Amino acid sequence: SASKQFHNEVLKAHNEYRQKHGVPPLKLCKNLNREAQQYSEALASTRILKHSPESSRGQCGENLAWASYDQTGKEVADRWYSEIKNYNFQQPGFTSGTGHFTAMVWKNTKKMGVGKASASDGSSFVVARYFPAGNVVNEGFFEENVLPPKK
Numbered sequence: 408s409a410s411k412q413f414h415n416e417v418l419k420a421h422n423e424y425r426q427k428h429g430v431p432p433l434k435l436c437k438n439l440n441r442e443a444q445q446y447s448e449a450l451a452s453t454r455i456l457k458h459s460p461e462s463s464r465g466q467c468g469e470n471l472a473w474a475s476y477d478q479t480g481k482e483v484a485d486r487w488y489s490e491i492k493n494y495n496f497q498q499p500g501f502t503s504g505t506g507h508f509t510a511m512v513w514k515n516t517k518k519m520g521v522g523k524a525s526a527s528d529g530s531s532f533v534v535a536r537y538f539p540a541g542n543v544v545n546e547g548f549f550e551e552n553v554l555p556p557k558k
């Protein structure tokens with residue numbers, strides 16, 4: 408099934424990148440998958456892109472992606488990770504230009520869910536949810552949770 412495939416591709420890419428950053432793997436979570444899929448259907452129905460109430464109260468972390476076409480899991484995770492090119496490891500903290508990358512690799516995050524839905528014009532709306540929530544801007548937390556890559 409297309410949904411299982413998308414789940415596998417997004418998780419495998421997240422975990423390859425987390426191993427590069429020396430943090431533990433994520434596991435998929437059934438409940439986060441179901442909630443992320445529900446939210447993706449709400450976004451695709453209106454063609455709107457904005458964060459959920461859950462995200463805005465810190466109940467979960469959330470990454471959003473859009474394309475005019477049905478996106479693969481690898482393509483979504485690679486696009487989010489590519490934000491590392493804008494991240495300054497000697498100036499740790501949030502920026503909008505790096506926020507999907509820093510949520511993907513956040514050390515303390517343990518579980519994720521993902522969903523995807525098409526709109527009426529064939530565009531697609533993707534939602535990933537993360538628990539515990541990352542991207543916490545409290546002093547020191549990015550330095551503790553967003554580690555440099557090792558080869």
Ligand SMILES: O=P(O)(O)O[C@H]1[C@H](OP(=O)(O)O)[C@@H](OP(=O)(O)O)[C@H](OP(=O)(O)O)[C@@H](OP(=O)(O)O)[C@H]1OP(=O)(O)O
Nearest residue numbers: 408409410411412413414415416418435436437438440441
């Ligand atoms: O729904 P069942 O007939 O009980 O089969 C389930 C189910 O397979 P389906 O995906 O077709 O529903 C699980 O998949 P989901 O719940 O993710 O949809 C799958 O888990 P996996 O996603 O890892 O394939 C699980 O397998 P398992 O219990 O070994 O983890 C498998 O159960 P059985 O294959 O043992 O029947």
